[PDB]
Design a protein around this ligand. Structure first.
Ligand SMILES: [Cl-]
Ligand SMILES: [Mg+2]
Ligand SMILES: [Mg+2]
Length: 242
Protein backbone atom coordinates (compact mmCIF):
# COMPACT_ATOMS: atom_id res chain seq x y z
CA UNK A 1 0.00 0.00 0.00
CA UNK A 2 1.65 3.19 -1.23
CA UNK A 3 0.95 6.31 -3.19
CA UNK A 4 1.86 5.65 -6.84
CA UNK A 5 4.88 7.40 -8.32
CA UNK A 6 4.28 10.06 -11.00
CA UNK A 7 3.92 8.98 -14.64
CA UNK A 8 6.03 10.84 -17.23
CA UNK A 9 5.51 10.10 -20.92
CA UNK A 10 8.08 11.81 -23.14
CA UNK A 11 6.82 12.91 -26.53
CA UNK A 12 8.25 14.49 -29.65
CA UNK A 13 6.28 17.68 -30.36
CA UNK A 14 7.65 19.92 -27.57
CA UNK A 15 4.29 20.49 -25.90
CA UNK A 16 3.72 19.14 -22.40
CA UNK A 17 0.39 18.37 -20.73
CA UNK A 18 -0.25 17.86 -17.03
CA UNK A 19 -3.05 15.39 -16.31
CA UNK A 20 -4.63 15.65 -12.86
CA UNK A 21 -6.77 13.00 -11.16
CA UNK A 22 -9.90 12.92 -8.97
CA UNK A 23 -10.37 13.12 -5.19
CA UNK A 24 -9.70 9.63 -3.77
CA UNK A 25 -8.49 8.54 -7.20
CA UNK A 26 -4.95 8.05 -8.48
CA UNK A 27 -3.24 8.80 -11.79
CA UNK A 28 -4.87 5.60 -13.14
CA UNK A 29 -7.83 7.97 -13.66
CA UNK A 30 -5.91 9.55 -16.56
CA UNK A 31 -3.59 6.78 -17.79
CA UNK A 32 -5.31 6.01 -21.08
CA UNK A 33 -5.83 9.68 -21.98
CA UNK A 34 -2.19 10.45 -21.18
CA UNK A 35 -1.03 7.58 -23.40
CA UNK A 36 -3.34 8.61 -26.26
CA UNK A 37 -2.04 12.19 -26.11
CA UNK A 38 1.53 10.88 -26.06
CA UNK A 39 0.74 8.72 -29.11
CA UNK A 40 -0.08 12.05 -30.86
CA UNK A 41 3.33 13.49 -29.90
CA UNK A 42 2.67 15.22 -26.58
CA UNK A 43 4.69 14.87 -23.43
CA UNK A 44 2.41 14.02 -20.52
CA UNK A 45 2.93 14.14 -16.76
CA UNK A 46 0.41 12.61 -14.37
CA UNK A 47 1.30 13.12 -10.68
CA UNK A 48 -0.44 11.45 -7.75
CA UNK A 49 -1.76 13.57 -4.92
CA UNK A 50 -0.13 12.82 -1.54
CA UNK A 51 -2.20 10.53 0.63
CA UNK A 52 -3.95 8.98 -2.34
CA UNK A 53 -3.66 5.23 -2.53
CA UNK A 54 -3.33 4.91 1.26
CA UNK A 55 -5.79 3.53 3.76
CA UNK A 56 -8.33 6.07 4.89
CA UNK A 57 -6.78 7.07 8.24
CA UNK A 58 -3.42 7.80 6.57
CA UNK A 59 -5.18 9.46 3.61
CA UNK A 60 -6.81 11.90 6.05
CA UNK A 61 -3.44 13.16 7.34
CA UNK A 62 -3.12 14.98 3.98
CA UNK A 63 -5.28 17.80 2.74
CA UNK A 64 -5.85 20.14 -0.17
CA UNK A 65 -2.68 22.11 0.61
CA UNK A 66 -0.63 18.92 0.13
CA UNK A 67 -2.48 18.04 -3.08
CA UNK A 68 -2.00 21.53 -4.54
CA UNK A 69 1.68 21.57 -3.54
CA UNK A 70 2.19 18.35 -5.54
CA UNK A 71 0.52 19.95 -8.57
CA UNK A 72 2.85 22.97 -8.26
CA UNK A 73 5.83 20.60 -8.06
CA UNK A 74 4.62 18.74 -11.16
CA UNK A 75 4.36 21.99 -13.11
CA UNK A 76 7.85 22.98 -11.94
CA UNK A 77 9.19 19.58 -13.03
CA UNK A 78 8.08 20.33 -16.58
CA UNK A 79 9.55 23.84 -16.46
CA UNK A 80 12.86 22.38 -15.28
CA UNK A 81 12.80 19.80 -18.07
CA UNK A 82 12.81 22.74 -20.48
CA UNK A 83 9.23 22.81 -21.75
CA UNK A 84 8.14 26.25 -22.92
CA UNK A 85 4.59 25.06 -23.73
CA UNK A 86 2.75 23.58 -20.74
CA UNK A 87 -0.99 22.88 -20.67
CA UNK A 88 -3.23 21.03 -18.23
CA UNK A 89 -6.29 18.86 -17.97
CA UNK A 90 -7.97 17.07 -15.11
CA UNK A 91 -11.09 15.39 -13.84
CA UNK A 92 -13.20 16.59 -10.89
CA UNK A 93 -10.66 17.70 -8.25
CA UNK A 94 -8.12 17.59 -11.08
CA UNK A 95 -10.31 20.01 -13.01
CA UNK A 96 -10.21 22.35 -10.02
CA UNK A 97 -6.39 21.96 -9.87
CA UNK A 98 -6.24 22.80 -13.58
CA UNK A 99 -8.24 26.02 -13.00
CA UNK A 100 -6.03 26.96 -10.04
CA UNK A 101 -2.89 26.31 -12.09
CA UNK A 102 -4.31 28.60 -14.78
CA UNK A 103 -4.72 31.37 -12.16
CA UNK A 104 -1.01 30.99 -11.22
CA UNK A 105 0.83 30.22 -14.46
CA UNK A 106 0.87 30.94 -18.22
CA UNK A 107 -0.63 27.62 -19.29
CA UNK A 108 -1.14 27.43 -23.03
CA UNK A 109 -4.64 25.88 -22.80
CA UNK A 110 -6.78 23.94 -20.33
CA UNK A 111 -9.41 21.19 -20.47
CA UNK A 112 -11.56 20.82 -17.35
CA UNK A 113 -13.76 17.71 -16.87
CA UNK A 114 -16.50 17.40 -14.26
CA UNK A 115 -15.36 20.25 -12.00
CA UNK A 116 -17.80 21.16 -9.19
CA UNK A 117 -18.51 24.76 -8.23
CA UNK A 118 -19.29 23.73 -4.63
CA UNK A 119 -19.21 20.56 -2.57
CA UNK A 120 -21.22 19.72 0.53
CA UNK A 121 -19.82 18.13 3.67
CA UNK A 122 -22.08 15.11 3.13
CA UNK A 123 -20.93 14.70 -0.46
CA UNK A 124 -17.24 14.71 0.47
CA UNK A 125 -17.78 12.29 3.37
CA UNK A 126 -19.71 9.91 1.10
CA UNK A 127 -16.74 9.86 -1.28
CA UNK A 128 -14.38 9.04 1.60
CA UNK A 129 -16.65 6.20 2.74
CA UNK A 130 -16.78 4.76 -0.77
CA UNK A 131 -13.00 4.98 -1.06
CA UNK A 132 -12.48 3.23 2.27
CA UNK A 133 -14.95 0.47 1.40
CA UNK A 134 -13.31 -0.16 -1.97
CA UNK A 135 -9.81 -0.19 -0.49
CA UNK A 136 -10.82 -2.69 2.21
CA UNK A 137 -12.32 -5.12 -0.32
CA UNK A 138 -9.29 -4.88 -2.62
CA UNK A 139 -6.95 -5.47 0.31
CA UNK A 140 -9.36 -8.01 1.86
CA UNK A 141 -9.04 -6.31 5.22
CA UNK A 142 -10.80 -8.17 8.02
CA UNK A 143 -13.86 -6.91 9.88
CA UNK A 144 -11.97 -4.99 12.56
CA UNK A 145 -9.42 -3.41 10.23
CA UNK A 146 -12.10 -2.17 7.84
CA UNK A 147 -14.27 -0.79 10.64
CA UNK A 148 -11.46 1.26 12.18
CA UNK A 149 -10.72 3.08 8.92
CA UNK A 150 -14.26 4.48 8.76
CA UNK A 151 -14.04 5.47 12.43
CA UNK A 152 -11.50 8.18 11.62
CA UNK A 153 -13.69 10.31 9.32
CA UNK A 154 -15.01 12.60 12.07
CA UNK A 155 -11.59 14.12 12.77
CA UNK A 156 -11.23 15.26 9.13
CA UNK A 157 -13.97 17.89 9.53
CA UNK A 158 -11.55 20.83 9.47
CA UNK A 159 -9.93 19.54 6.28
CA UNK A 160 -13.37 19.21 4.67
CA UNK A 161 -13.98 22.89 5.44
CA UNK A 162 -10.56 23.71 3.96
CA UNK A 163 -11.47 21.79 0.78
CA UNK A 164 -14.72 23.75 0.50
CA UNK A 165 -12.89 27.07 0.84
CA UNK A 166 -10.35 25.90 -1.76
CA UNK A 167 -13.19 25.43 -4.24
CA UNK A 168 -14.78 28.78 -3.35
CA UNK A 169 -11.53 30.66 -3.84
CA UNK A 170 -10.98 29.22 -7.32
CA UNK A 171 -14.60 29.93 -8.34
CA UNK A 172 -14.44 33.56 -7.19
CA UNK A 173 -11.50 34.27 -9.50
CA UNK A 174 -12.34 32.53 -12.77
CA UNK A 175 -12.18 35.86 -14.61
CA UNK A 176 -8.39 35.82 -14.35
CA UNK A 177 -8.20 32.68 -16.51
CA UNK A 178 -7.77 33.84 -20.11
CA UNK A 179 -6.08 31.13 -22.16
CA UNK A 180 -8.09 28.84 -24.45
CA UNK A 181 -10.35 26.57 -22.43
CA UNK A 182 -12.55 23.51 -22.91
CA UNK A 183 -15.09 22.89 -20.14
CA UNK A 184 -16.56 19.38 -20.25
CA UNK A 185 -19.26 17.55 -18.32
CA UNK A 186 -21.11 14.27 -18.67
CA UNK A 187 -24.79 13.92 -19.46
CA UNK A 188 -24.91 10.85 -17.20
CA UNK A 189 -23.36 12.74 -14.28
CA UNK A 190 -25.56 14.45 -11.72
CA UNK A 191 -27.33 17.63 -12.91
CA UNK A 192 -25.21 19.70 -10.53
CA UNK A 193 -22.15 19.07 -12.73
CA UNK A 194 -23.95 20.56 -15.73
CA UNK A 195 -24.88 23.59 -13.62
CA UNK A 196 -21.28 23.81 -12.43
CA UNK A 197 -19.87 23.57 -15.95
CA UNK A 198 -22.12 26.36 -17.25
CA UNK A 199 -21.06 28.54 -14.32
CA UNK A 200 -17.37 27.88 -14.88
CA UNK A 201 -17.61 28.46 -18.62
CA UNK A 202 -19.53 31.73 -18.18
CA UNK A 203 -17.08 33.18 -15.62
CA UNK A 204 -13.84 32.40 -17.42
CA UNK A 205 -12.09 35.42 -18.89
CA UNK A 206 -10.99 33.47 -21.96
CA UNK A 207 -12.00 34.77 -25.37
CA UNK A 208 -11.49 31.28 -26.86
CA UNK A 209 -13.61 28.91 -24.81
CA UNK A 210 -16.02 26.05 -25.41
CA UNK A 211 -18.51 24.06 -23.38
CA UNK A 212 -19.05 20.36 -24.16
CA UNK A 213 -21.73 18.30 -22.48
CA UNK A 214 -21.12 14.75 -23.66
CA UNK A 215 -24.39 12.88 -23.42
CA UNK A 216 -23.06 9.41 -22.64
CA UNK A 217 -20.20 10.33 -20.30
CA UNK A 218 -20.39 9.72 -16.55
CA UNK A 219 -18.72 11.72 -13.78
CA UNK A 220 -15.30 10.13 -14.32
CA UNK A 221 -15.34 11.10 -17.99
CA UNK A 222 -12.04 9.40 -18.72
CA UNK A 223 -13.42 5.94 -17.92
CA UNK A 224 -16.19 3.75 -19.25
CA UNK A 225 -19.08 4.73 -21.47
CA UNK A 226 -18.41 7.56 -23.88
CA UNK A 227 -14.63 7.45 -23.48
CA UNK A 228 -13.84 7.42 -27.21
CA UNK A 229 -15.89 10.59 -27.77
CA UNK A 230 -14.34 12.26 -24.72
CA UNK A 231 -10.81 11.44 -25.87
CA UNK A 232 -11.48 12.57 -29.44
CA UNK A 233 -12.73 15.91 -28.11
CA UNK A 234 -9.85 16.50 -25.70
CA UNK A 235 -7.18 15.39 -28.17
CA UNK A 236 -8.62 17.62 -30.92
CA UNK A 237 -8.56 20.52 -28.45
CA UNK A 238 -4.88 20.00 -27.56
CA UNK A 239 -3.96 19.36 -31.21
CA UNK A 240 -4.76 23.03 -31.86
CA UNK A 241 -1.29 23.64 -30.33
CA UNK A 242 0.37 21.97 -33.31
CL1 LIG B 1 -14.06 17.03 -6.08
MG1 LIG C 1 -5.05 4.96 -29.85
MG1 LIG D 1 -27.71 21.08 -21.38
Amino acid sequence: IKTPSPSYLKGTNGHAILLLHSFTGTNRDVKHLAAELNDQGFSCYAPNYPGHGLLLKDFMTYNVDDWWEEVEKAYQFLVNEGYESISATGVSLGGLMTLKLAQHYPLKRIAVMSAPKEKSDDGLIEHLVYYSQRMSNILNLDQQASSAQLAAIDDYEGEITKFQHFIDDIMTNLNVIKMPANILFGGKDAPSYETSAHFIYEHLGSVDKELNGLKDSHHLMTHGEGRDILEENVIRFFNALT
